[PDB]
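dumping the sequnces here before i forget
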Amino acid sequence: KTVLEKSKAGAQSRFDSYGKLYDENINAGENQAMTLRASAAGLTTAVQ
Amino acid sequence: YKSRLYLLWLEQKEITKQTGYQTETDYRYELKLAHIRYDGTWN
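..and the predicted 3d for all of it:
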């Protein structure tokens, strides 16, 4: 029973870890990176 | 003008009149007019 409870706690750790990554999918940093790419491609009418 | 922001400025260029023997510095003027677009850029 102790063997399976360590297996239970190991699977529970992965389920919490990937569930946390899934729910918070895009960071504040990863959101800022897309915003910069979008701003760099919005200059084409002002350059013209 | 028609609910759009316009800038209007006078701009000067110096030209060179000839007076022959010599020549002479002279100025000419032009009016520039620009407006803002929908995305915040200027025409």
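Chain B touches chain A through four residues (CB under 8 Å).
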